[PDB]
Design a protein around this nucleic acid. Structure first.
Ligand SMILES: [K+]
Ligand SMILES: [K+]
Ligand SMILES: [K+]
Ligand SMILES: [Mg+2]
Ligand SMILES: [Mg+2]
Ligand SMILES: [Mg+2]
Ligand SMILES: [Mg+2]
Ligand SMILES: [Mg+2]
Ligand SMILES: [Mg+2]
Ligand SMILES: [Mg+2]
Ligand SMILES: [Mg+2]
Ligand SMILES: [Mg+2]
Ligand SMILES: [Mg+2]
Ligand SMILES: [Mg+2]
Ligand SMILES: [Mg+2]
Ligand SMILES: [Mg+2]
Ligand SMILES: [Mg+2]
Ligand SMILES: [Mg+2]
Ligand SMILES: [Mg+2]
Ligand SMILES: [Mg+2]
Ligand SMILES: [Mg+2]
Ligand SMILES: [Mg+2]
Ligand SMILES: [Mg+2]
Ligand SMILES: [Mg+2]
Ligand SMILES: [Mg+2]
Ligand SMILES: [Mg+2]
Ligand SMILES: [Mg+2]
Ligand SMILES: [Mg+2]
Ligand SMILES: [Mg+2]
Ligand SMILES: [Mg+2]
Ligand SMILES: [Mg+2]
Ligand SMILES: [Mg+2]
Ligand SMILES: [Mg+2]
Ligand SMILES: [Mg+2]
Ligand SMILES: [Mg+2]
Ligand SMILES: [Mg+2]
Ligand SMILES: [Mg+2]
Ligand SMILES: [Mg+2]
Ligand SMILES: [Mg+2]
Ligand SMILES: [Mg+2]
Ligand SMILES: [Mg+2]
Ligand SMILES: [Mg+2]
Ligand SMILES: [Mg+2]
Ligand SMILES: [Mg+2]
Ligand SMILES: [Mg+2]
Ligand SMILES: [Mg+2]
Ligand SMILES: [Mg+2]
Ligand SMILES: [Mg+2]
Ligand SMILES: [Mg+2]
Ligand SMILES: [Mg+2]
Ligand SMILES: [Mg+2]
Ligand SMILES: [Mg+2]
Ligand SMILES: [Mg+2]
Ligand SMILES: [Mg+2]
Ligand SMILES: [Mg+2]
Ligand SMILES: [Mg+2]
Ligand SMILES: [Mg+2]
Lengths: 46, 93, 271
RNA sequence: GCUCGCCGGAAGACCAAGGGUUCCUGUCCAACGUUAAUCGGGGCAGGGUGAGUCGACCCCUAAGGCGAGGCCGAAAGGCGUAGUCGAUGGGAAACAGGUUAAUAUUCCUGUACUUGGUGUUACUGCGAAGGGGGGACGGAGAAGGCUAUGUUGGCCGGGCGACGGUUGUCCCGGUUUAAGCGUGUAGGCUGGUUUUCCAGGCAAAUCCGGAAAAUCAAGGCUGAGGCGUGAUGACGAGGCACUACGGUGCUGAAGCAACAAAUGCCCUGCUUCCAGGAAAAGCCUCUAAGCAUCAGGUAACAUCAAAUCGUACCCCAAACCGACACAGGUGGUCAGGUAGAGAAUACCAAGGCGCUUGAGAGAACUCGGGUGAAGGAACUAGGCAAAAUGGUGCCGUAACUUCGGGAGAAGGCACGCUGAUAUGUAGGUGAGGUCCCUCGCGGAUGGAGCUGAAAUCAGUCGAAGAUACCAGCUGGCUGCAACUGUUUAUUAAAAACACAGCACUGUGCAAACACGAAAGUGGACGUAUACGGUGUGACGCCUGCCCGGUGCCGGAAGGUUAAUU
RNA sequence: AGGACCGAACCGACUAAUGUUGAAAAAUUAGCGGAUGACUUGUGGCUGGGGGUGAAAGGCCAAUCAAACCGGGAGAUAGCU
C-alpha cells in the first residue's frame, strides 16, 4: 500500500529547508529555538 | 597566466593502482591526486611547468570519501579529485 | 440551425446542438489571441470564492473590440468565428487601413458586410454611434454605460436594448432584464441585436457536457449535515426552515441590491 | 559440472525518483542472515565513477512564489507594480567498434558534428529595452508509404549420428554493419515575381498588414524511407593456440534476396468534430536613437576555447516507501518464436531464477484442489459456495420500445486431418523485358519469382476436432433509481450523492455573492440567451384547494418608538 | 459518432474462502465493475484548523478528525476511582 512518506528532495528543501525557514519570522524563530536547544542539525538542508 | 604559486599547490600526489599503471603503460596517461578546486586548465599548466612534460588533455573526476567506523564511531573520509593526464606520446613521465 | 441527436446512447438521447455552418472552421486570428488560464473559482487567497467552477476545456482569449473607436474608417467582415469565452459569435473585420479587429457578431452580419463607427455612420446593423445620433426606438447592443468606456450592456447571444426615450443629456433604455435605465446620450451603441439567438435552444444532454464547460456539481444544502449548511440535517428528507444561502441569507425573494450611488440612473426596476 | 524445475509485456533489460558505496578484489565468520555457512547487500582493508556533443549548470518562460517604490493594515504583517525566480514544457552539437575485476555515446580506434572568441582576405549599411514573423500547440478517425523486426530461400562453414532410417525435398550454425555527408523520393502545404500607393503595427521601417496594376505560369517551403558513401574498414560461424581452467592471444568463410510487418516513422500531416485546443526565448526580419571610407554585418580560410558539477551500484526492489532480507506500493523506456484477434493465454528464446531451515512419516483435524453410485436445492436467511455456460461462421430470434433498442434475446447446424478442385485457388507483392519521357528515387505495359485466405467435393481417425490454456448460464414477474458517473481510505456502493432537464428567486456591473479589520481578489477580462442561491431530478401525462400561522415582497395614513435636544 | 459495446494494460473494490500474536496496523486467492472518459497518471504548485476541501459519507486534511499535530497557560479542574 502507498504509505505517507513519499520522498522528494526538492519538495523537502522547499518546504523545510534553511531558506524557507529564513523566509519568515516564524521560521526564524524555529531556527532560534533549535540553536538555543543546541541542535547539531538546524534544518533538513543538512 | 596562471601563477606559479597556484601551480605549485594543485598537484598533491601521484595515484598508485593497477588502473593507474595500466593507464600509464597503455595510453600514456598519468593518474594524480589534485586539489579539489583545481580546474583542468590549472592541472595542465601545472603538469607542464613542474614535470616538464607536454600534456595532451586532462580528464578529471571527484572521488567521494567513504563512511568508516573507528572503534565503532562513525566518520567520513574526505572527497578528493583525481586527474587523468594524457601526455603527448614521447614525454616519459 | 438546431439539430436533435439520435438516441444511439443514453448520453446522446437528449442532446440538442446549435450548429452554424457559417462559422470559420480553422484557427482564430493569432495577433488577437491571449492566454487565459483558469481560476477554479479561487481568489488570490487561494480560497474558493465562487463555488462550482473548475476543469473544462482549455480556452484562448480573443481580444474583442468593445469600444468600436476606429471612427470614420469602414471595415469589411472577413469571417464569423466561434468564441469559447462568450455565448455570442465574433466577427473578424478588416479596416481599410489594414488593421484587423474582432467584434461581437450581430444578427444578420455575414462575410462581406461593411461596418463603420462614428457620428457619421449609417443606421445599419453592425454600425456604432453615440446614442444621440441613433433614432428613438432603435434596437442596439453592446451599449456603453460611460462615454468611451466600451460596451457593457446587451452582449450575450441574441440580446439587445431598446432606446425608449431621449431627454437632454440622457437616453432611457429598456434593458433585456426589463429594467428602465438612464445612460448618457454620448455613450455608444451598436445597431441591431447580438447574433447567435439560437444559443439558448441547445440542450446539454449529459453531465459531462456541463463539466466540459467548467461547471462542477452543485450539492443541495438539504443533502448536507447541519454543520455544513443551514439546510443540513434530518432523519430522512426533512426541511422545515426558510430557504437560505449556505451563509444563512434568505434565498427566495429577499432583495440584495444595495447601491445608493447608482439608484438615480434606474427609472423602473426589472419587475 | 551434468540433469531437473520456474519466469519470460518478466521473476529479463535500461532509467527517472529515492537511496548512498550497497559496486569490484582480497580477507574474516564473533554479531547480523529466522537453520548451517567455507557464502552475503555482514566485518575489515584496498580499489573503482575519466564528457565541447549525455544530464545538471546555462538561455526561455507556465502554474505559482518573492517583490524596489506603491496601496493597505494596532504591531507583526497583507496585496501588488517594475522586476526577479520558478520545469513537469521551448532552446547548439557523436556515432559504430574495442577495452576494465569494477567506467564508458566519457578511455581507445575509426569516422563526424555544434557554438563562440580572436587573427587575416574579400564584399559591405550596421545598429534595440522597440515593430513584424516564427516558435506555437485540441479530441477522434482514416488510409497510404515506410522502417524496427520476423520468416523462408540462396550463400558460407560444419555434420552423416548411442536404437530402425538419414548424401537428402537431410541436420546445426552464421549470414551484422552507425552517426555524418551526398541524393530531395512516397507524400503535405503554398500560386510566384516586379513596381506604385496607403487613416494600421504607440516613433521608424526597405519588414508585416492593406490597395492597385503588369507579367509568369511553376517557383518555394517541408518530407519518412530507399540508394550511394562512410566501409580495400569493423564485426563475424568457426578453427588454432595456450591457459594462474576465470578466460585470454592469433586467424578468418559467407555476409545476399524475396515475402510478411508494427501501437514505432512520414504525421506539429490529412479528414472531421466541438468542448475550440500554453508562454517566452533561441531563430528570421525591420527600422529608431546613433555610428558613419571607423566600429559593425556577411563570407571563406586560420587559430584558440567549450569551464564546473553528476557519472560506481540497486532501481516493480533484500539497496526506494512499508519498524523486517516484509506475498503490499512505486512513473518512463525496450517488446523475439509457435499458436492466437491480442501487450489475453499456453509453451519457449535472449536473459534470469528454485523464493536462506532441512529430513522423515503418510493419524485425527485445518487449508488448497481432483473424482464420485442413486437422487438433484430435499441445503439454507439466501443456490452462500460449487457445478454449469463459454469460440468463430451461418440460420434464426417474442413481448415491449423513447424506434436507438430489447438482442449475443431464445435456439440450432458446421468445425480435426488428408487429397483434389487448383502439382497453390481468389487475392497480395513484384524481377527481368519492352515502350514513352517534361531524362530520374521517371511513367505505361509486362508479368517470372515470392506469399496466400476461404470454400466445395471425396476420403479418413477417435468416445469426443471452439479437444489444452482461454472462453456469456438462460428465461419469466415485480419494487427503487432515468441513464454513464460519485461515496462512508480501514465492517454500509445503495434506493444515498451527482446528473442533463425543470422551476422559483436574487443580480444593471464598482452586479448579486464569496475571501479579506483593509488594500484588494474571485465572480469575469463575463454583462440578464449572463452570473449566484435554492428546490426538484431523463422522458411521457401532469402538478388540484388554502395567504389564517411563519417568512419574503409592497405600502406609508394612523399609533408606538433611540440617540439627540 | 458515442460520459457506445466485448475485453488486457491501467483505475477500482461486489461476493466468498483464508488470514485475524497476519506474509500485510486492511492483504492474498478465485470470481467482480469501469476501461476515449464527469477517465487515469508523473512532476511541480495553491487552499491551514471553527479553518481548508468535500458528485455530501461528518468524508478527508501524513496509520490521528463532531474540530489535526507540536509547544505553552499547566501541577486546568477532578464533591470520583
Ligand atoms: K437528512
Ligand atoms: K440521517
Ligand atoms: K481546531
Ligand atoms: Mg577526451
Ligand atoms: Mg566529468
Ligand atoms: Mg452555482
Ligand atoms: Mg442544478
Ligand atoms: Mg448524510
Ligand atoms: Mg446551523
Ligand atoms: Mg421523515
Ligand atoms: Mg413535518
Ligand atoms: Mg558498507
Ligand atoms: Mg558484491
Ligand atoms: Mg559457527
Ligand atoms: Mg546463524
Ligand atoms: Mg560487504
Ligand atoms: Mg508570474
Ligand atoms: Mg507579494
Ligand atoms: Mg516595500
Ligand atoms: Mg528566469
Ligand atoms: Mg524539464
Ligand atoms: Mg556495470
Ligand atoms: Mg525491413
Ligand atoms: Mg494505442
Ligand atoms: Mg552505470
Ligand atoms: Mg527471504
Ligand atoms: Mg518486497
Ligand atoms: Mg503501476
Ligand atoms: Mg502472460
Ligand atoms: Mg493429507
Ligand atoms: Mg477438503
Ligand atoms: Mg467433482
Ligand atoms: Mg454424485
Ligand atoms: Mg451420476
Ligand atoms: Mg435434473
Ligand atoms: Mg427449502
Ligand atoms: Mg430445511
Ligand atoms: Mg455464486
Ligand atoms: Mg467454477
Ligand atoms: Mg413490494
Ligand atoms: Mg442509479
Ligand atoms: Mg454504475
Ligand atoms: Mg468502508
Ligand atoms: Mg464495501
Ligand atoms: Mg471587481
Ligand atoms: Mg431528490
Ligand atoms: Mg423522485
Ligand atoms: Mg464505454
Ligand atoms: Mg474509492
Ligand atoms: Mg483480485
Ligand atoms: Mg457496462
Ligand atoms: Mg469492458
Ligand atoms: Mg449521519
Ligand atoms: Mg488519516
Ligand atoms: Mg473544540
Ligand atoms: Mg493557570
Ligand atoms: Mg493533573
Amino acid at each position: 500500500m502507498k504509505r505517507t512518506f513519499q520522498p522528494s528532495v526538492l519538495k523537502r528543501n522547499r518546504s523545510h529547508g534553511f531558506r524557507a525557514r529564513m523566509a519568515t519570522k516564524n521560521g526564524r524563530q524555529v531556527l532560534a529555538r533549535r540553536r538555543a536547544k543546541g541542535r547539531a542539525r538546524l534544518t533538513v538542508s543538512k | 597566466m596562471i601563477r606559479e604559486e597556484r601551480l605549485l599547490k594543485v598537484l598533491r600526489a601521484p595515484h598508485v593502482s593497477e588502473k593507474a599503471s595500466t593507464a600509464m603503460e597503455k595510453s600514456n596517461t598519468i593518474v594524480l591526486k589534485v586539489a579539489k578546486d583545481a580546474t583542468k586548465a590549472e592541472i595542465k599548466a601545472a603538469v607542464q611547468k613542474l614535470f616538464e612534460v607536454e600534456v595532451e588533455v586532462v580528464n578529471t573526476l571527484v572521488v567521494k570519501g567513504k563512511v568508516k567506523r573507528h572503534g565503532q564511531r562513525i566518520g567520513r573520509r574526505s572527497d578528493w579529485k583525481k586527474a587523468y593526464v594524457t601526455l603527448k606520446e614521447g614525454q616519459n613521465l | 440551425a438546431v439539430v436533435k441527436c439520435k438516441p444511439t446512447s443514453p448520453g446522446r438521447r437528449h442532446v440538442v446542438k446549435v450548429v452554424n455552418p457559417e462559422l470559420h472552421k480553422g484557427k482564430p486570428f493569432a495577433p488577437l489571441l491571449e492566454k487565459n488560464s483558469k481560476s477554479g473559482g479561487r481568489n488570490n487567497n487561494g480560497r474558493i470564492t465562487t463555488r462550482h467552477i473548475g476543469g473544462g476545456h482549455k480556452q484562448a482569449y480573443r481580444i474583442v473590440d468593445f469600444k468600436r473607436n476606429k471612427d470614420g474608417i469602414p471595415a469589411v467582415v472577413e469571417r464569423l468565428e466561434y468564441d469559447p469565452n462568450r455565448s455570442a459569435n465574433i466577427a473578424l473585420v478588416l479596416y481599410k487601413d489594414g488593421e484587423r479587429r474582432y467584434i461581437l457578431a450581430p444578427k444578420g452580419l455575414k462575410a462581406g458586410d461593411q461596418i463603420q463607427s462614428g457620428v457619421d455612420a449609417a443606421i445599419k446593423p453592425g454600425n456604432t454611434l453615440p446614442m444621440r445620433n441613433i433614432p428613438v426606438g432603435s434596437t442596439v447592443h453592446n451599449v456603453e454605460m460611460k462615454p468611451g468606456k466600451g460596451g457593457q450592456l446587451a452582449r450575450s447571444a441574441g440580446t439587445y436594448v431598446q432606446i425608449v426615450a431621449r431627454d437632454g443629456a440622457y437616453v432611457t433604455l429598456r434593458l433585456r432584464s426589463g429594467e428602465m435605465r438612464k445612460v448618457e446620450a454620448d455613450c455608444r451603441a451598436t445597431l441591431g441585436e447580438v447574433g447567435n439567438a439560437e444559443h439558448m435552444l441547445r440542450v446539454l444532454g449529459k453531465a459531462g457536457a456541463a463539466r466540459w464547460r467548467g461547471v462542477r456539481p452543485t450539492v443541495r444544502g438539504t443533502a448536507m449535515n447541519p454543520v455544513d449548511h443551514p439546510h443540513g440535517g434530518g432523519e430522512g428528507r426533512n426541511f422545515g426552515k426558510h430557504p437560505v444561502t449556505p451563509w444563512g441569507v434568505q434565498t427566495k425573494g429577499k432583495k440584495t441590491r444595495s447601491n445608493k450611488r447608482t439608484d438615480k440612473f434606474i427609472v423602473r426596476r426589472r419587475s
